[PDB]
Amino acid sequence: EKDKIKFLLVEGVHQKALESLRAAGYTNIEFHKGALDDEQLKESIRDAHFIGLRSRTHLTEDVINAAEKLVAIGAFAIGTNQVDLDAAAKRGIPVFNAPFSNTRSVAELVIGELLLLLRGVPEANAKAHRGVWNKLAAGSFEARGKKLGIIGYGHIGTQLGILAESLGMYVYFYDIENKLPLGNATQVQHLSDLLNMSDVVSLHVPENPSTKNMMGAKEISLMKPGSLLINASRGTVVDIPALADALASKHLAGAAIDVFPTEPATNSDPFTSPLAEFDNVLLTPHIGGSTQEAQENIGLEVAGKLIKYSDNGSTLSAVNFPEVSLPLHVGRRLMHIHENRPGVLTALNKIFAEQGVNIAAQYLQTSAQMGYVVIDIEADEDVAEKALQAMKAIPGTIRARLLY
Amino acid sequence: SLEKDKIKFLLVEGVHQKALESLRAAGYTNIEFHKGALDDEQLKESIRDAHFIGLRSRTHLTEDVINAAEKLVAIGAFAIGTNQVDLDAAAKRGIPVFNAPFSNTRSVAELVIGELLLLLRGVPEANAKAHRGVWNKLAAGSFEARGKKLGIIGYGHIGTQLGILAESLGMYVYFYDIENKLPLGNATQVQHLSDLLNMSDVVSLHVPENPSTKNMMGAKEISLMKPGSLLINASRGTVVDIPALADALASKHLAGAAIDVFPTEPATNSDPFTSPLAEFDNVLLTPHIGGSTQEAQENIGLEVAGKLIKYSDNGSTLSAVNFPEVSLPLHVGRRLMHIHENRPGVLTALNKIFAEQGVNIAAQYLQTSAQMGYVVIDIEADEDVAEKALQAMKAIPGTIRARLLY
Amino acid sequence: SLEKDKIKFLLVEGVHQKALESLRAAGYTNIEFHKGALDDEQLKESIRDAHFIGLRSRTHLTEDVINAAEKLVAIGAFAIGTNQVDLDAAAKRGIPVFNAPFSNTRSVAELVIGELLLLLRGVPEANAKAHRGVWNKLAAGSFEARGKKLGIIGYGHIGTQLGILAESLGMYVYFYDIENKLPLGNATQVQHLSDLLNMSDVVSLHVPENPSTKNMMGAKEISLMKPGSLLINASRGTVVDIPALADALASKHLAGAAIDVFPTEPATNSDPFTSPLAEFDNVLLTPHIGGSTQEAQENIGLEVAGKLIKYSDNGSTLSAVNFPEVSLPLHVGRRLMHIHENRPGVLTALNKIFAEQGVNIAAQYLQTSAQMGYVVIDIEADEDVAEKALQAMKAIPGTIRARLLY
Amino acid sequence: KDKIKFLLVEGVHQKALESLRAAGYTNIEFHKGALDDEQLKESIRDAHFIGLRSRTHLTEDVINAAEKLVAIGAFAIGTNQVDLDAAAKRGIPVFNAPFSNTRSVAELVIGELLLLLRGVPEANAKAHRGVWNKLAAGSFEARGKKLGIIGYGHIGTQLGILAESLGMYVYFYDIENKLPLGNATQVQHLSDLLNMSDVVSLHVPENPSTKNMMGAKEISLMKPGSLLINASRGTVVDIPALADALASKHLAGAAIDVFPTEPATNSDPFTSPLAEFDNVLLTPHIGGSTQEAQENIGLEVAGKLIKYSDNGSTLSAVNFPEVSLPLHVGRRLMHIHENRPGVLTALNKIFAEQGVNIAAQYLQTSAQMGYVVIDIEADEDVAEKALQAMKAIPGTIRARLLY
């Protein structure tokens, strides 16, 4: 049975995804290096139970809704904005992704980036390439003994810190919440302190309304003269022209930016920033999280998630679905996804009692529009298959399945 | 203290402030401080009456200039290189030269870490493309440093510090050296360079400039490096065959390089730079700034002020680059020194002068090179006797210079 | 908050204060704190109107005591062990029991380091020699721990932590586990237990108790051990064949050992302890104090208080050692819980009611052990509807306890 | 190089032998233990180099009849078992190993504080008697605790690093300002250190500044319920006061490895008022007694004898003027002599006359004696006549041509 369950993988996900699939028993895998055109996409997805895609493939309403057999969708990536998360929820297909798999990559990028900035290496290299030699030591520093101020002490600030400390930098941080320090990191309660003390400032924050432009003319002029600004969290967090200002003012020595409010949609599309005129700014194409090793983690994680769901019904971490997860105990497990009618649960429970079946466990979780419930029962294939078909006749029923 | 005040220290070229702090602490307070270089003209003027000089790599102390200063005792290269100073001519006049050969250790190790971090990410190519309107975001062939193998070639002061910083970052560290060296942390000596080249994700060079290292990284070797690997050189301009490096990068056998030193380099920051490596967005080129930081300058300042101060106080030429190295521990009595050409009978005039004043020599350190000879002598005696002996010493044929240091 | 004042916490055997700060930090204030153990008249007396109780290892909660505790909602064993508690008995009554399985971690790793350092150094013997008046200065046989190899048998909470500290000190760290573990730091998993016994200078046991571990370190395993090596068992009393170790100690195949646990241990600090290990000055014997520290007692106070708090506030039996495990995140509404013998028709009545009273179910999590079942039900509605429902819930034939939690 | 005889008595580490073998010196009379007076006299009577430990006594009488002997090697730190004077008179330098066990002392301290903070020594002593005493009250983890180090030199410095890798916070007191390593904080007043520390350890030298610097007062200023560890010197702690403070329970325990008076050997009785305290570790001065240190000493002191014989370095000799000369083309000769006028004048005259250029020379004196190394550019024959002539300067204790 498991090997009649087809995974469609596009955009060159990492091999380990494929390894995990196969070791879980899912050996039916149509895999693609690039993205597919419209007519091939619909061809390959017409009968896929699962799909793993990444940034570029668009699962629009129409695409999802022609996908006849689609059980869940796996964004092997961070973003899910290429998927109709809500079209998908109406057909009862959850969407998973990998939000915290890039951590070491971003941390590393930053460390690498600051080392070079503190030295004026970006600037020296740009001149070098056009035949201008600029050997000077004025302005330049080792990072050892410098103060690094991390704004955003989440999954990434944490690891950034640990590295910064590995290199003997002094580590201070600001987060709108009280965070337990690792090694000898130090929490600064006010942001204007952190800015003042810090030789380099790094942002590691979510894209919310506390963060839109959290760094303006104001905040930046608060920063130490000669300092460095690093942004590789979100494109909206920093007011580019402000920093452009502060960079010609030479109030800042330089900067690195891996994200922008606006980004080229493909790589053939042009890039535009005013920062593009500063040799002392590292400008990178949102590759903060782009490494093979990151790809391997996203591989392990989003396959892992698809498989768990397929095998156990778990929606822990699904982005568009009520979150359920029940531990394994002996018996059969079934599951019902449905509109939020009242008395679906009354309907469900009546079914098992009629058949004289004990419900070992169940977990119903509701969102505004939908409901998902996983029920364990002690019974045989015959019995479970009838409950199944009965469960499929409940009013509201979007989808239901015997998982084992 | 009133006798210190007489010794002109001239520091040009903007040496670190802690150099002056170190003079002052040692009593030497008369100092002509210049932030920049001086022309032919105000050189010879500020120097004329100058006991000690401090230059970096732009002041040119050539023969004529060295002949011009009527009172120069030592020279302090507050940098590594000494090629800007005619070593064989301060020697001729009995002026030892000093420098700071290893005051740049962290700075170079730090720089290499940053470079390899960004090169494994295809960041330099990304930044160049980005700054000209090209976006190119992809994950293929970009990698993290952690878990990667670093191949350090030349495991001396810098290799070693580089290695330490590298394993702190998660890298497995290997090295090759022509001598057998004791590893720190989990570094590993590799017996063949071809072994080390075949394995490394990154190879970084910290060897010295000499026949063995001249073009030691040539075609054959680059060819032995791992496909998709990285070449880094912040050692010497003559270690890597650059045309070869260029041909490897063009055929994508190497995926990047960072080079800080070149066969030939620009003499000032107004002199243009060229290299066949300029055509590559995936190569960091930096203008010999491996050891160019303020921490490094601070280190050089203390090192060399100390050497100059020590020479002045106790006559040590330990570490001097063009001069016989003598030093003797302070040890009760009066101390003299005597720099001479190796004339027959100099030593023999030296002890008769003391014999002939019934003066006991508690200590004597004599060292020579080709025609030069430096000897420092520690004596139990009066001052008038110490001053008298000095006069006698100064008249010995072959005597370049001699001084009663205390 | 006046609601809470009703709910009596009975703490015996003197648990750490941090337990009381959580308790009071959560509006929970009727606390009957005791430092010591209680006798039966003291216990029934002081438990009869207890809503919760925290005890330790000496308090014996039997069926006759439990079937007396009239208001007993849950039981916290402020400890690792639960053998002093009658789990089936409290399960029969719908009383979760909780504990702190992994709260002693650092306290055990810290002990083993101290011990291995002094053992390698032959300190226990020199100490006992000194106190008896004998001076034994030697260097034959003593070692620093840096660069020696630690074999950890059981690579879990304590093992992992043990290896981290050991690496801090420069030891080489190897482990053998029955399952495949991700090694921390530079830790190395050894696949065959015999190579590990073969290479290791010190071997420290950190495994559970069970047939797979029982006497798992016997005469065979002891001889696989490196000459002049050291054994340390602070896991469980059944894992080492003490008389085998005693023989290997007598024969000097081993240099020493540290045993904190024993097949038979005194019931109280008043009962004598005997061991054929008592004869050997080069063995540390410790009265099962592996996890006995104040920091550990404070880990415990926090973990176990938090849990009893969480259960009283939100139903969570996540972690119970004798009860179905249920947990639901919070959001908008009110929340019921319901404990019942699993009887025909319970879930049917539950849902019949909700539709009698017109209540829409937001979330529901039911789990069961054998005849026992526990369901926690979030519903959206106002307090009259709620408590209308819960009164019907207690009427369902089978119900053991139902509470409108919030 | 085979004609040179080394006598190593008392089981110096095998790295000493491995090194002599490397440097091409193979004639070795090795002895696991100490020689009694006749054997010693017979093995040494032709030895060039003796390497001993702390039990051997090279007295004048033995040294003096020691015919072929050129340098002495204490594979140890003490040189009080060696008559340094008798040895100089005869121009025999004495080498030893000043600091070869810093880690060993730091380790002992870490293990001791960790157990002592757990009451493990008492607990263990009780368990050896039948008494079980399981308790958490008063037992403490090391991490998060204040360790106060008194004396921040080789060993203090090191100990604070370990302590830090354990999670302790490290404070220190030193009579001078020092650069703290890691998170170490220098503490300007002894009393302030004493009050704050959960565990105090000592690493000062033996001198008046140091005698009983920890007395009734200082102990009473230690935090109630803290620990004192001394592996420094026997003269640093007022022991009776410590006793008192363990008796009154102001201190929860101590560890003492050094004592005002120590048995001379393992066979002599050891006594002490602390012996009655199960919560006190007592150790027979083994803070440095480990194989790693014995090996470190092995390379070091073998290193120094090899160096003296190959090139004449007397750097670190404890009884001799220190002279050292880098090496250069030519021959090298050596003169040791009584410090008195014109030796150097006749030395130098010898080379003047045979018309031989002196490439360098280094002489250094004491009050009573003088040593000088000479690099000359000449064939072997001329160096020989020179030797013979230098051997004759009145004043000459000894002269040798090294290469």
Ligand SMILES: NC(=O)C1=CN([C@@H]2O[C@H](COP(=O)(O)OP(=O)(O)OC[C@H]3O[C@@H](n4cnc5c(N)ncnc54)[C@H](O)[C@@H]3O)[C@@H](O)[C@H]2O)C=CC1
């Ligand atoms: N450039 C790239 O390729 C990638 C960018 N990122 C971005 O990095 C950001 C953070 O990453 P994680 O560490 O995984 O997030 P996280 O959720 O684990 O941590 C973010 C932290 O910022 C804190 N925070 C939230 N609002 C704040 C406010 N505005 N002011 C100060 N602190 C605030 C939160 O407390 C949290 O600690 C996200 O935007 C993520 O998308 C992550 C991976 C790759």
Ligand SMILES: NC(=O)C1=CN([C@@H]2O[C@H](COP(=O)(O)OP(=O)(O)OC[C@H]3O[C@@H](n4cnc5c(N)ncnc54)[C@H](O)[C@@H]3O)[C@@H](O)[C@H]2O)C=CC1
């Ligand atoms: N670009 C820059 O800013 C600067 C460049 N440098 C250069 O870095 C180089 C290394 O500096 P340090 O580590 O301080 O020197 P170092 O002398 O301490 O280390 C050099 C090591 O290389 C080994 N070696 C010699 N020849 C070799 C060969 N043929 N193959 C392999 N190994 C060989 C030696 O045994 C020695 O261990 C020097 O050339 C120095 O001038 C140093 C500072 C700055």
Ligand SMILES: NC(=O)C1=CN([C@@H]2O[C@H](COP(=O)(O)OP(=O)(O)OC[C@H]3O[C@@H](n4cnc5c(N)ncnc54)[C@H](O)[C@@H]3O)[C@@H](O)[C@H]2O)C=CC1
């Ligand atoms: N002396 C004392 O006061 C204390 C003793 N302990 C005991 O120490 C032991 C370990 O504690 P934790 O680290 O929390 O346990 P843990 O469960 O986290 O670690 C046990 C590890 O050993 C492995 N293992 C199981 N059977 C094995 C076998 N036959 N051979 C090799 N490995 C095996 C398991 O797979 C697991 O990874 C437990 O027995 C615990 O009761 C715990 C606290 C204090």
Ligand SMILES: NC(=O)C1=CN([C@@H]2O[C@H](COP(=O)(O)OP(=O)(O)OC[C@H]3O[C@@H](n4cnc5c(N)ncnc54)[C@H](O)[C@@H]3O)[C@@H](O)[C@H]2O)C=CC1
């Ligand atoms: N029991 C044993 O096996 C051994 C004992 N020791 C003893 O340990 C002691 C320390 O050894 P090292 O670290 O090698 O010595 P060290 O010379 O490196 O350090 C001594 C430090 O103590 C300081 N000091 C001197 N007088 C002081 C005072 N009154 N108050 C505070 N600080 C003072 C000095 O500033 C110096 O920093 C020495 O006595 C040594 O003999 C050393 C090795 C082994």
